[PDB]
DNA sequence: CGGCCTACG
DNA sequence: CGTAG
DNA sequence: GCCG
């Protein structure tokens, strides 16, 4: 088992779901307390279990696995022996965890805002609604739409959204293309938002594209909220006899950068953090969603595909459905 | 012990 | 500060 | 919290 998540296939479904879920609760709780290091370790340990070929049945099977030390091993041991881990259950039922989870789920609210509200004594969404001047426009939209945004987006919803995005993109710039990214590109059947990447085969033609796309979607009445190359939107999606709000992200990249942007926006989040960590620490190359830089030659790698990027970094290629770290 | 991804709005 | 994978 |  290699130590970086980008060095191993991780499928969407696996053989250690309960164990990974428990470690991810502790990762989430670490993040609510501002402990990014502990968050990363628990995320990585969870991800190692997702990559195993069969269920962990005995504590012995953790020996040698990366990111399993005393703490993560104890969590697993308690789950194997008793079916529950006391620490995990204490987190789950804690007022702090539940409220921080509720507040940070709001579009426009991060850990720092949620924590301040928590320390002020706020606990529920209606608490927030009763003092609306205390909220940004973005937070107001996130609160108004919170119920719809909590409802899973289905793959059927995604196909409908992609056609309407393509129509606006085609008027904004004939020849521009729309690619589904994020979790749905990794094979998820549901999700909490839809991610699209837009480019044009003629380098430079994509300049100024996103405003033109946004104005066209808004003129079609489809945009419930929007605030450039990244747009974080709430879209009106038709439903039987009505509609629902859906989070949609639209990103533009020049075709020279498209493989990097595709790689970055396909995720998973942990996969990409691990890939960038691997690039820099193991290969001395600096990776982002725009390119891959050699800081000794002061040159950027040209890539025509995701396959090119994995080759550059000396990694076996993983298709999107094996990037579910 | 230092490090923990790296951007854009 | 928020957002994204 | 863990790795190197
Ligand atoms: Mg997504
Ligand atoms: Na949020
Ligand atoms: Na998104």
Task: Characterise the protein shown here.
Belongs to the DNA polymerase type-X family. Residues 186-195 are annotated as: Involved in ssDNA binding. The relative contact order is 0.11. The chain has helices spanning 17-32, 36-50, 70-82, 86-93, 95-104, 111-119, 125-129, 137-144, 146-149, 155-172, 182-185, 209-219, 258-266, 269-283, 306-312, and strands at residues 153-154, 177-180, 190-191, 194-199, 223-225, 230-239, 242-252, 286-288, 291-294, 299-300. It is of the alpha+beta class and 325 residues long. A hairpin with a 4-residue loop joins β5 (223-225) and β6. The strands form three sheets. It has a five-stranded mixed β-sheet with strand order 2-4-7-6-5, sandwiched between helices. A three-stranded antiparallel β-sheet has the order 8-9-10. The protein has four domains: 1-94, no CATH class; 95-151, no CATH class; 152-255, no CATH class; 256-324, no CATH class. The protein has 15 helices and ten strands. α1 runs antiparallel to α2 (36-50) and α1 packs across α4. The protein is globular and about 60 Å long. Bound molecules: magnesium ion (MG) and sodium ion (NA) (2 copies). Magnesium ion (MG) binds next to α11. The structure holds three DNA strands.
